[PDB]
Paper text:
We verified that the Mimivirus and M. chilensis predicted PAPs were able to perform polyadenylation. These proteins were not only active, but also intrinsically self-processive, generating >700 nucleotides long polyA tails. To elucidate the molecular basis of this processivity we determined the Mimivirus and M. chilensis PAP crystallographic 3D structures, which revealed two topologically identical subdomains with a nucleotidyltransferase fold. Thus, while other PAPs form heterodimers with processivity factors, the Mimivirus and M. chilensis PAP become processive upon homodimerization.
Since they shared the same characteristic features, we will refer to the highest resolution structure of [name]. As observed in solution (see later), the [name] crystal structure reveals a very stable homodimer with an almost perfect two-fold symmetry axis (179°) and a 3200 Å2 buried surface area upon dimerization. The dimer structure highlights a large tunnel at the interface between the two monomers. The N-terminal domain (D1) encompasses an extended strand followed by a long helix (α1) bent at the P28 residue. In each monomer, this helix creates a domain swap, and makes contact with the D4 loop located between α13 and β16 and the α7 helix of the D2 domains of the other monomer to form the dimer structure. The third domain (D3) of the [name] structure surprisingly mimics the catalytic domain topology leading to an internal symmetry between the D2 and D3 domains (rotation of 162°, 2.4 Å translation and Cα-rmsd > 2.0 Å). Two of the three catalytic residues (F286, E288, K342) are replaced by non-canonical residues in D3, and an even longer insertion within the helix-turn motif (37 amino-acids) of the NT-like subdomain is present. The interaction with the D3 domain is stabilized by a conserved disulfide bridge (C350-C426) connecting the beginning of the β14 strand and the β16 strand in the D4 domain. Electrostatic potential calculations highlight intensely positively charged grooves on each side of the entrance of the central tunnel, which is contributed mostly by the positively charged D4 domains and to a lesser extent by the D2, D3 domains. RNAs could therefore interact with the PAP through the positively charged grooves and reach the catalytic site through the 10 Å diameter wide central tunnel making the two catalytic sites accessible for a ssRNA molecule.
Author numbering:
A (entry chain B): 4 to 262, 278 to 516
B (entry chain A): 4 to 262, 276 to 514
Amino acid sequence: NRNRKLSYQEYYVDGDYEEVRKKLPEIIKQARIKASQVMEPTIYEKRVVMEIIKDFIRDKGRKVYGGTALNETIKKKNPEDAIYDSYLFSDIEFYSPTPVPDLKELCDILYHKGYDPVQGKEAQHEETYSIFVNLQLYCDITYVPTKVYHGIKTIEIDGINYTHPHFMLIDYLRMINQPLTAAEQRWEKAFDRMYVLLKNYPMEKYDNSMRITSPRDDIQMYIGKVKSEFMKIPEIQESCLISGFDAYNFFIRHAMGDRKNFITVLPFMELISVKYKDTVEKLYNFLREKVVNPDLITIDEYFPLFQFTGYSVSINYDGIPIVKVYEADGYCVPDIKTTSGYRYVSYQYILMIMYISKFKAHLDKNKEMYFNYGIAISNLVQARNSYLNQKNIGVINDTVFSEFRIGCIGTTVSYTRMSRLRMLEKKKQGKVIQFVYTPKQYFSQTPEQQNNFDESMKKYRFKNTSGNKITIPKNLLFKIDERGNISEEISTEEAYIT
Amino acid sequence: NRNRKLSYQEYYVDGDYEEVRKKLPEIIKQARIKASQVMEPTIYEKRVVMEIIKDFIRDKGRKVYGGTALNETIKKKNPEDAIYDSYLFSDIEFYSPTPVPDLKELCDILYHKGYDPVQGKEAQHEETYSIFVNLQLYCDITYVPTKVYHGIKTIEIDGINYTHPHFMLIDYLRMINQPLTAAEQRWEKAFDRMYVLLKNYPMEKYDNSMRITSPRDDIQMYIGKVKSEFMKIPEIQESCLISGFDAYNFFIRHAMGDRSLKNFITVLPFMELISVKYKDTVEKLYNFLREKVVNPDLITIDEYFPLFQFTGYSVSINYDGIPIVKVYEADGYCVPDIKTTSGYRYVSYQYILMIMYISKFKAHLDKNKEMYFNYGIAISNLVQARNSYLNQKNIGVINDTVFSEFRIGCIGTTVSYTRMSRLRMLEKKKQGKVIQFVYTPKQYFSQTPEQQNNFDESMKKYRFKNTSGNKITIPKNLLFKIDERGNISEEISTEEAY
């Protein structure tokens, strides 16, 4: 008894959905291609500005990363595997040890060539700067500390240095290894990019065996006590993840199952902590009461390395490392909880760690460790392949070898929340919210006003992500008194370079 | 130089890609669910703030639109067709005739309830305001002129007024009808939403015949000269599109093919055009009619303000108080067209479908019962003619005929949403205008009673653009000037809208 008189028509029937879904991606591509030809700035205008930027990159030997680098390295291997149509405009992202001087020089070149408006601005990502020509984004310039910068491996195509795919793979693994913050917006795209990257640039196979020097007998026993006793403390199990070679041996052991030459001697323990200061204090104290001579215990602190690691420590006995701790506060780290109670990092996490550790050994010119990490990567891929084959399972499964794991330990916050809180901190500190360089404004000024700007540019310092040992006491996160006791420095100042 | 000869291993085999692709959507959902339980603000905190907003919407009778409205109206019809699960967070969007007073009242309620930080901010799209509680977006408040607002049809669910799906359909058609600017970011999602909308709220079937009064014999001949002569001028063919009932008769004619009923053909009450060179067209058309008419002193122009987000400025060129032709402003849009062998253009099928919807809504606001039923019948006839045509031709919804959907061919100069938005910001900056209006209750209640009352008065001195769709009665607001000699010129005037 609602309303009987109503008649309706069927606009879409069953089968129409599938037809549109299949046809839409190509229609959308054609609409994008057409738009590029008739809308200001046109593809013809875009190409001319892009060639100027490319000339600067070529001249300076700057290292291109992101989509453009992945598209070019893939196209070199197989043109049918490209991510860009190369009619459909994309901005160029490049690394630089001097991003603000580069930003000015490139903005000046475009200004003197008759382009207006031309502006270089600070991007959303701090330490990244963007160039806009006629309100259109053309390139991103990212700071890389000099030492790290020269160590980035590239493939030269048409005179341009493109970041090696296996360096770029670290960034896709970083997204996969942040399940609570990156899954929603990055995982589908990260998998797509990783898949085509590895298809064209596959995992290497190494035949060699690892050459790790067995530590001094006392060191070996101290290492053993970190795993057998320190990793038993409930507060430690809930805030720490076993990483490095001990996590690597765990994955090898699971692949053997006993039904062996891949297993390595442990040079030192390596942990990742989400309560960094708390862990370092408790670990230093633990070693102080297990060791023969407590006065022979030292701590070496290291600055973060690029975008790859946080602050770290090396707790040494008689100048020999026992254990290394890495800061992960603010991240929810992917874990594997064992029946023993202790946690290991996930498979994709240890894979990323081996990649970062191999890159660090390459920066340190440590030939022995560079080849050892390379072999560990090869062995980890092999152990995983053998395991999935043996158990007849997919890449996503219910074992320790599963990919796209969401289980993690540690408090975290969304990228959006963190970004808004960072803006509030900048606003409170009376600091510049967004830096802007306009060559029109610059060259209209008097030579005194121009020199006042050129000095201001030189007084800017970036965070210290060199990975170097901390030598300035005011930059150290931990204090060791004359009685050898650990305390956190409450009045620690942010360290800058250069 | 020289690529090395190395050994490689497998990482992804056939068909690991497919396995990941299928499993990822659910893994991502679980990562999002977990994140909402452990990350600040939690789903529990979000639900409490959302209930306060919903209480305000319910008390004020505000009309909800977008995703929330579509999800709720669909669920009412069939719960298995939900566009998203209501466990997870989604922001709410609602229409208002007083969006700034509503924004203040709702921000004040949340402030007095103990929430901090609380801010109401101007959104990226002008006339829309956003509420942020603890750095999280909760709702969007969009301005709708009073007369238009009361005319929006709703479905009441749990005390909340949700915009009728067939009003919301106009907005999805708007996206489809902007191929060069909306294809990339909106078309796939717009199709998905339209499909589920029409499945649950189908196109109606009307049996009735249209009752359009045949114009006076002279008007009929004048109407004919607009089509037979005016539409043949090459600059007119390249800047105008035939719309209204003449474009409707074109689609009916194609459906029947002259050898989809013959009784579907209507008498033309007046010509209706859409121009991408609006002022140029109106001037030329007024001049054309001045020539062809007996007694040019009987020619008048009635101007109309834009209607909501649906139409631009319009004119009605009348003879002896009788309309001959109506012109609609579309400058800045690339309008989807059908170019005939004759040279003149019609709007596309999905374009005329949207026009009939807008025209029916306008007739509803004007309380023009005759035209309201006429446009309703034209919609029913247009869906029927298309269905009959595709059925006989045995073709998909995307085809090479005049009845094809997702057409990319269009006429007129356009620019990206991003470029337009940046140019608008520059204009606001030059004019010394507020770039982004922000209301912070904390700051307000901390201010003196004079400062607080200075703000309350500012909130009354603010004028939105006149999008009432009313006839312009103030001479200073008219876009076209008619002198004592009856000649047309474009009016200068910078500011005023009522």
